[PDB]
Design a protein around this nucleic acid. Structure first.
Length: 95
RNA sequence: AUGGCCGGCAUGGUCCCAGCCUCCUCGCUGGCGCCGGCUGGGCAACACCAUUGCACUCCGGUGGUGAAUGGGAC
């Protein structure tokens, strides 16, 4: 259990009734102030719906975002944030 | 008539205006009498069910047409 600090924050318990394009945009709307964002990956498949991967360029940003937005009401539901289990390719491709 | 198709019945005709209808050419050269049955596509939108799930491969399922009216000129 518990994951180590990552460039990517995993968010779940997201309102599934929201279309993908929008959700990505809305997330960017509230997480950009924590640092540059490389990408946000949203999938509405059975397995990946209700979750999202916010990929920050600097771990500190992900750390800040994780500590502040935890519990935040988004689309009438409280976000549940953690660090992603493994680096995201966009990250591998660099560091 | 409809995503494509057949049958029973009913029913004077053509146009104009508005209102309403719908998953499958959204609107003025689409449709808006009654009844029965045959079959295809798709989750794209809408809805419902199920799902709290760690990805970098798009990808659970089911439902709707089993729909919607009047006025006016000839």
């Amino acid at each position: 259990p518990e994951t180590r600090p990552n460039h990517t924050i995993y968010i779940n318990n997201l309102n599934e009734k929201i279309k993908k394009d929008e959700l990505k945009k809305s997330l960017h709307a509230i997480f950009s102030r924590f640092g540059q964002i490389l990408d946000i990956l949203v999938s509405r498949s059975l397995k990946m719906r209700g979750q999202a991967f916010v990929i920050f360029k600097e771990v500190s940003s992900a750390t800040n975002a994780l500590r502040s937005m935890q519990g935040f009401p988004f689309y009438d539901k409280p976000m549940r944030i953690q660090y992603a289990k493994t680096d995201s390719d966009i990250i591998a491709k660099m560091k």
